Amino acid sequence: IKEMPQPKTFGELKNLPLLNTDKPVQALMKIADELGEIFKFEAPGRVTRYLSSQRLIKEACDESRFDKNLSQALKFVRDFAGDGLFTSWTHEKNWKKAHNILLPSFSQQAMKGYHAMMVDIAVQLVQKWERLNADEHIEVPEDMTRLTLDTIGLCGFNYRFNSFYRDQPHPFITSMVRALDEAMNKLQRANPDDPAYDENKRQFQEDIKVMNDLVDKIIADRKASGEQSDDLLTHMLNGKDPETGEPLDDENIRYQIITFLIAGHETTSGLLSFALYFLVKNPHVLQKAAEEAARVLVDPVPSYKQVKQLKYVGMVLNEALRLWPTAPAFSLYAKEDTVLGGEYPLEKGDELMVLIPQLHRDKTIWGDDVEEFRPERFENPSAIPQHAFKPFGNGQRACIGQQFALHEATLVLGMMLKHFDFEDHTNYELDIKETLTLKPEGFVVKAKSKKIPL
Amino acid sequence: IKEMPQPKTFGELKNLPLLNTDKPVQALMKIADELGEIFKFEAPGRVTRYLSSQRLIKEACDESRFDKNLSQALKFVRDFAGDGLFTSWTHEKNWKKAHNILLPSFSQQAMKGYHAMMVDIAVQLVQKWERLNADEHIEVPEDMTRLTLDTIGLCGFNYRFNSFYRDQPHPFITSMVRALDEAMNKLQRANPDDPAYDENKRQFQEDIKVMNDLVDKIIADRKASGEQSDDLLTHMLNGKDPETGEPLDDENIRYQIITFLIAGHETTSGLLSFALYFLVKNPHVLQKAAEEAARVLVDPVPSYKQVKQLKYVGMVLNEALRLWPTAPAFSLYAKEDTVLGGEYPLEKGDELMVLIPQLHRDKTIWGDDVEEFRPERFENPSAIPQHAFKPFGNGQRACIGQQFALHEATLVLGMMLKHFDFEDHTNYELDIKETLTLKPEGFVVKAKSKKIPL
Ligand SMILES: CCCCCCCCCCCCCCCC(=O)N[C@@H](CCO)C(=O)O
Ligand SMILES: CCCCCCCCCCCCCCCC(=O)N[C@@H](CCO)C(=O)O
């Protein structure tokens, strides 16, 4: 039985002021570097324990001992995402119902069905970059957000955000980013009902209204339609849970649309941005990935099977998720009194935070070179110990979109590597913007066309 | 020998305050309706005479008697267009030099060479409209400006404005519209050096700077690439005048690029916008034009020969130019003392304004039904009397871009009518915005895809 380390305190505010930063996850990573595999984090009225080692996280991921918790971040996101899949408790009827109804939308058959629509948006990205004039640059996270939002909109809902027709952000994206930024900024507030935050509350409610206006349109467009889609929205509106025999109700469907639009693009745009960052910073890796893209993508547009054959591109994406997992933490609660790691007694209800970027830097798992970008770590994924690589969370509450996101990202990165040479013309200094999720900010490159037609 | 009518005066300001309107051409048309084929227009320090009848305009179009004048509008535009083709005097060396160098850029061989690049931009417009969601509308003049600017940029200069990648105007367009608007607004100013206009002068100089920054880039991009292109810019940079044996100088080339970018898209965007307006207001005419497009455009993209075959679409465009010629006036001066129409003595140097929309409503030429949209007026072209139809001006100073504009507009309207049904869903009330040039403002439609693939 050991005493846990704890970072510096601020009297009655305990550790809460450590979150007074626009980069809280990066601040918690530096605390983990200083304190090691576990530290206690106290705020007025609550406590959590941040885990960073595979040794402890393998126990936290035991579903007999621990269940998904709503972190403070997810309790704030639930103000607009409700009992959608991401912000529901495992014990809420609508979690297992929606899980059973929507999992078929991510089957191999469903994925083959989304492929043509993913290609539609990927081709729009390639055409945009082919059409740039001499010495014009690419705003990477901006174009990756255009691609990923359009992809989940079209594949999921047969709705065109038409992000490549806009030089300004879509109103949905402005409102979504401001809602996530507010949830993050609320983490540091000792007194969230201080009238100082009344303007924040008004702006938050307006941003929720903008997101719900978009959901209204997606639903109306579908119920009107004389087409026959068989997509994610078809399953939301028509699917029956085999267990209860019930379909989703209208209120829950609205929460699922909001959930899948946000979760289904924010994280994937981050991944593609980080992957391109690591490729331009590691030219031998870029060359190996470009050689694979040239060898495999022999047709004007990629087939489903060709994307499955881009092994090295997949390894690049996994290595980007290792260093900068774009949903960088998840929360658990103890189902019963238990002892963690033979050293740390927990009571029923006690909360843990898994700090995924730190798990992914565990030298006992990955070796001393953890900061190096080396896709070859994923040559045989079976070599990775249980619960060592967790960019998609854990168990029955793991990411439903994992295969969707990796297919989209592999297709798009494959086409990018086939069609262009890339230049880090500014020698960009990585700057990671936090909105609960992680993404490079201000990342620009130049693309030189290889002049290969579509 | 007759005395000319004159509209209402404002004491020492004479007729100048009649131009204190954002719709001066439409105001002059209403004056012509009241006063007839000729009226005197006086301002402090000058006089011109507005002509509205074919009887008088056929004499004004005699190049032995009258030469092109710079109107006050063109003298203000010359502040940025210099001695480019539009704002040069016929007797300036650089007019005939540039005319001889650039005329071959509008040959049939040149037009066949521009066709593929016109199709590139037209396909971008069709894809934009195919990608709209249920019950979304089209902003017609906004999308026609996107198309026409992109077309002259790509065909003329191998430069991509990428207007379909923007929901906000290109900086060039904002600056160009504001410079034309300032030229129009300056027409009414009795005291242009009043300090009240100091902000107008600063903004005008800034807008000239933005336009010249774009010209810098177009030239640099070309001189860097080498040649490879054989387009309008190739002739500007390399062509020699067969008469003098001289190429254009650097200063004149810059003025020609500004001239062709402005003239080469503002007028054409207005034509396409008015043509679509008249088609949705005249459904029998829309059906005839749509039937021709379906019958002729049998391939995924139109050929040069197929566009030459769209006779009825061409008649629609000519009938839109009859009612709303988008460069709606041109100015002449008397080369010598002469008598106009046996009734109006003029002295050498005396100025005339041809009010083209009024010429085009001359009932003695067209019949009593001049306000009706009837493309069949153009079914037997030789039947149009000499100098009755002047949307491209007159003689050696006629529009150099006439064939380019009508090819672009016939291709684009043909593809629009092939791919979509149109609905005037707001029962739009025509509102004509003036910036020297004419274009509908606030014109919106709904397009229903015919689901014909590209
Ligand atoms: C609607 C679906 C999309 C939801 C957005 C995805 C969010 C994914 C990441 C959420 C965790 C971010 C970690 C924030 C840093 C942190 O450690 N927070 C703790 C602070 C201690 O209270 C907490 O929220 O308690
Ligand atoms: C650089 C290439 C683009 C040039 C801009 C195209 C301009 C087309 C001109 C259209 C006619 C403008 C008529 C304005 C109304 C008018 O009648 N103005 C008189 C007023 C009397 O002085 C004048 O300008 O004296």
* Of A90, A65, A57, nearest in space to A391 by CA: A57
Query: Mutation test of the interface with chain B: which of A128, A138, A167, A225, choosing the one with the most B Cβ atoms within 10 A?
Result: A167
* Of B75, B138, B409, B387, nearest in space to B264 by CA: B409
**Cα–Cα dist B330/B214, whole Å:** 28
B365: left (phi over 0), alpha (psi -120 to 50) or beta: alpha
B294 φ, ψ (degrees, to nearest 5): -65, -45
User: Which residue, judged by its Cα, is nearest atom 22 of ligand 2?
Assistant: B72
A4 close to A40: Cβ distance less than 8 angstroms: yes
Q: List beta partners, residue A49.
A: A40, A352
Cα torsion angle, B247, B249, B250, B256, sign: negative
**Mutational test site, ligand 1, from A25, A30, A75, A187, max ligand atoms within 8 Å of CB:** A187
Q: Which residues contact B210 (CB under 8 A, 6 or more apart)?
A: B171, B172, B174, B175
**Cα–Cα dist A243/A204, whole Å:** 37
Token look-up 């003029």 returns B346
Q: Does A224 touch chain B (CB under 8 A)?
A: yes
Token look-up 């044996």 returns B245
**Cα–Cα dist B302/B133, whole Å:** 26
Question: Can you read off the two tokens belonging to residue B155?
Answer: 């065909």
Q: Does A454 touch chain B (CB under 8 A)?
A: no
A392 is annotated as an active-site residue: yes
A358 close to A57: Cβ distance less than 8 angstroms: no
* Of B150, B153, B128, nearest in space to B139 by CA: B128
Question: Can you read off the two tokens belonging to residue B42?
Answer: 């006086």
CA distance to A155, A255, A401, B139, per residue, from A264 (Å): 11, 13, 7, 31
B365 φ, ψ (degrees, to nearest 5): -95, -55
**Cα–Cα dist B409/B313, whole Å:** 9
Q: Please spell the DSSP secondary structure of A213-239, one letter per residue.
A: HHHHHHHHHHHH--S---SHHHHHHH-
Question: Can you read off the two tokens belonging to residue B219?
Answer: 């030239």
H-helix or E-strand spanning residue A139? strand A138-139
Radius of gyration of chain A (CA): 22
Question: Can you read off the two tokens belonging to residue B326?
Answer: 């988008």
Structure method: X-ray
The SS3 of residue A54 is helix
CA A340 to chain centre: 28
**Cα–Cα dist B212/A192, whole Å:** 53
A58 close to A77: Cβ distance less than 8 angstroms: no
Report CA dihedral (A317, A322, A323, A328) to the nearest 10 degrees.
110
Question: Can you read off the two tokens belonging to residue A157?
Answer: 């809902």
**Cα–Cα dist B281/B134, whole Å:** 23
Q: Is A367 exposed, middle or buried (0-12, 13-18, 19+ CB in 10 A)?
A: exposed
CA distance to A77, A91, A174, A214, A267, per residue, from A262 (Å): 11, 23, 12, 12, 8
H-helix or E-strand spanning residue A419? helix A402-419
Per residue, the 3-state secondary structure of chain B, as one string, reads CCCCCCCCCCHHHCCHHHHCCCCHHHHHHHHHHHHCCEEEEEECCEEEEEECCHHHHHHHCCCCCEEEECCHHHHHHHHHHCCCCCCCCCCCHHHHHHHHHHHHHHCHHHHHHHHHHHHHHHHHHHHHHHCCCCCCCEEHHHHHHHHHHHHHHHHHHCCCCCHHHCCCCCHHHHHHHHHHHHHHHHCCCCCCCCHHHHHHHHHHHHHHHHHHHHHHHHHHHHHHHCCCCCCHHHHHHHCECCCCCCECCHHHHHHHHHHHHHHHHHHHHHHHHHHHHHHHHCHHHHHHHHHHHHHHCCCCCCCHHHHHHCHHHHHHHHHHHHHCCCCCEEEEEECCCEEECCCEEECCCCEEEEEHHHHCCCHHHHCCCCCCCCHHHHCCHHHCCCCCCCCCCCHHHCCCCHHHHHHHHHHHHHHHHHHEEEECCCCCCCCEEEECEEEECCCEEEEEECCCCC
Question: Can you read off the two tokens belonging to residue B373?
Answer: 């949209």
User: Which own/partner contact pairs does A285-292 have at CB distance under 8 Å and 24+ positions apart?
Assistant: A285/A316, A285/A373, A285/A375, A286/A417, A286/A422, A288/A312, A288/A375, A289/A313, A289/A316, A289/A375, A289/A413, A289/A417, A290/A417, A290/A418, A290/A421, A292/A417
The packing angle between helices B250-281 and B140-157, to 10°, is 140
A60 close to A51: Cβ distance less than 8 angstroms: yes
**Cα–Cα dist B105/B246, whole Å:** 17
The SS3 of residue A196 is helix
Token look-up 């499955």 returns A308
B417 close to B290: Cβ distance less than 8 angstroms: yes
Which positions of B are catalytic?
A: 267, 392, 399
**Cα–Cα dist A388/A58, whole Å:** 8
User: Which own/partner contact pairs does B115-118 have at CB distance under 8 Å and 24+ positions apart?
Assistant: B115/B303, B115/B304, B115/B307, B115/B407, B115/B411, B117/B151, B117/B154, B117/B155, B118/B151, B118/B155, B118/B407, B118/B408, B118/B411, B118/B412
Cα torsion angle, B158, B164, B166, B172, sign: positive
Token look-up 């490159």 returns A445
What do you get for the CA distance between the two ends of chain A, in Å?
Answer: 63
* Of B381, B262, B226, nearest in space to B318 by CA: B381
List ligand 2's pocket residues with C-beta within 6 A.
B 19, 24-25, 28, 41, 48, 71-73, 77, 81, 86-87, 187, 259, 262-263, 327-329, 353, 436-437
* Of B177, B153, B178, nearest in space to B163 by CA: B153
B207 close to B185: Cβ distance less than 8 angstroms: no
Give chain A positions within 8 Å (CB) of B168.
167-168
Within 354-383 of A, beta carbons closer than 8 Å to B belong to none
Cα torsion angle, A266, A267, A268, A271, sign: positive
Burial A174-213, CB ≥16 within 10 A → b, else e: ebbbbbbbbbbbbbbbeeeeeeebeebeeebeebbebbee
B165 close to B128: Cβ distance less than 8 angstroms: no
Which of A76, A373, A389, A392 is catalytic? The answer is: A392
CB atoms within 10 A of CB A55: 16
Q: Does A226 touch chain B (CB under 8 A)?
A: no
H-helix or E-strand spanning residue A48? strand A46-51
Half-sphere exposure of residue B347: CA atoms within 13 angstroms, side-chain side: 2
Q: Is B356 exposed, middle or buried (0-12, 13-18, 19+ CB in 10 A)?
A: buried
The SS3 of residue A342 is coil
CA distance, residue B224 to nearest chain A CA (Å): 9
Resolution, angstroms, 1 dp: 1.5
What do you get for the CA distance between the two ends of chain B, in Å?
Answer: 63
Report CA dihedral (A412, A415, A421, A423) to the nearest 10 degrees.
-10
Half-sphere exposure of residue B398: CA atoms within 13 angstroms, side-chain side: 14
CA B320 to chain centre: 12
**Cα–Cα dist A176/A257, whole Å:** 13
The amino acid sitting at A142 is E
CA A255 to chain centre: 18
Q: Is A320 exposed, middle or buried (0-12, 13-18, 19+ CB in 10 A)?
A: buried
Max intra-chain CA distance, chain A: 65
**Cα–Cα dist B410/B407, whole Å:** 5
Domain extents for chain A?
A: 1-454
